[PDB]
Design a protein around this ligand. Structure first.
Ligand SMILES: Nc1ncnc2c1ncn2[C@@H]1O[C@H](COP(=O)(O)OP(=O)(O)O)[C@@H](O)[C@H]1O
Ligand SMILES: [Mn+2]
Length: 355
């Protein structure tokens, strides 16, 4: 079984996603996404071997007929998904990049001499890296997996196939305390002016933590307003809001449509309603009560009510969120909130392997 991601980090954390070019994985229909993982010789899990983009049904080349059942098998692109590490852990970052580059060279040899065969659990020649196979029901094939023989491809990785996910303490969002926090706060959807705006609205209120409440208000309001903006732009059916009732033609399949996720640029990956836990019950109620008018002064009553209600009931920004991530002291863990960089910015390029 492929280990689940570790959830706790002392400070800011980072994960990388790297789509490979030059090959496909073929697996039975409705297989689990993970088919293996690469770990260090010391035992530390570095990255997962996953299927990503469906490339159509798999057909075993007739010249490679082996008496085996490949019925209803699907081909997919391969994505290498790192286990998260500490952002400032140079050794952990470098080992992940080197292990991905080694695996690409091992795949290059695999499609040359073992085309349309599963990957075997092996140790690298230098002894640094180990492949563990968790689903033996797969095959690796050059190109698009149609021909029996490769075109002598080198397995590569490119910025267009790359993403990074940064995890930070939820209490830090809006403080600009670290370079990672300043990078996240530069997201176009994040409206820092909402912090001082909240301060002006709540002068007569006796808040348990005014600075923390203003940070949470600005974070949540920015997300709610961006969601309403995107629903209107792409004609998204959010909760009970119908874009067609406001003469908007749908041009996305939902909040999880890749073009909608790209529009965020820095995509929140954690359920927004979780951040309410970092505040006192009293402070949370004061923050929540002030969000509704921010939507209603910019958007229709129906869109404002539907976006507010959706996130209040634990709705996700774009599908299944990473909601169990934590930061700080292992004994008294604090909420971590994660963000996907849809395109890797210059500041995070050093975390990504380069062919
Ligand atoms: N605590 C964490 N801190 C930072 N990044 C994390 C953390 N947990 C997971 N990630 C990262 O999030 C990404 C996971 O997205 P993914 O599971 O591949 O989506 P899906 O399976 O739905 O296609 C990886 O880069 C992983 O390292
Ligand atoms: Mn995936």
């Amino acid at each position: 079984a492929t280990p689940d991601f570790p959830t706790h980090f002392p400070k800011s954390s980072i994960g990388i996603q790297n789509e490979l070019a030059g090959l496909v994985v073929a697996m039975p229909a409705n297989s689990a996404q993970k088919f293996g993982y690469v770990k260090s010789a010391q035992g530390d899990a570095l990255f997962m071997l996953t299927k990503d983009m469906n490339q159509g049904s798999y057909q075993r080349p007739p010249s490679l007929q082996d008496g085996k059942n490949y019925q209803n098998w699907q081909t997919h692109t391969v994505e290498l998904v790192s286990y998260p590490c500490e952002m400032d852990d140079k050794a952990a970052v470098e080992t992940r990049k080197q292990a991905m580059l080694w695996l690409a060279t091992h795949f290059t040899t695999h499609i040359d001499q073992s085309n349309h065969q599963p990957l075997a659990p092996i140790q690298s020649e230098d002894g640094r890296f180990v492949i563990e196979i968790t689903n033996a029901k797969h095959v690796i094939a050059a190109g698009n997996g149609i021909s029996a023989e490769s075109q002598g491809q080198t397995i590569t990785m490119t910025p267009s196939g790359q993403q990074a996910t940064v995890g930070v303490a939820a209490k830090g969002f809006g403080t600009s305390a670290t370079p990672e926090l300043r990078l996240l706060e530069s997201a176009p959807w994040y409206q820092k002016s909402l912090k001082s705006q909240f301060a002006s609205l709540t002068s007569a209120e006796n808040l348990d933590d005014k600075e923390l409440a203003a940070n949470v208000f600005a974070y949540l309001t920015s997300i709610y307003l961006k969601t309403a903006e995107l629903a209107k732009k792409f004609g998204i059916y959010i909760n009970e809001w119908d874009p067609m009732s406001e003469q908007i033609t749908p041009n996305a399949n939902g909040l999880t449509d890749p073009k909608v996720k790209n529009a965020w640029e820095i995509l929140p990956r954690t359920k927004p309603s979780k951040i309410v836990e970092i505040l006192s019950k009293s402070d949370a109620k004061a923050v929540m009560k002030h969000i509704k008018p921010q939507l209603q002064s910019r958007y229709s009553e129906s869109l404002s009510k539907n976006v507010f209600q959706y996130f209040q009931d634990g709705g996700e920004v774009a599908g299944h969120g990473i909601n169990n991530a934590t930061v700080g002291d292992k004994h008294s863990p604090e909420l971590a909130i994660l963000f996907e960089f849809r395109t890797v910015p210059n500041e995070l390029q050093s975390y990504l392997p380069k062919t």
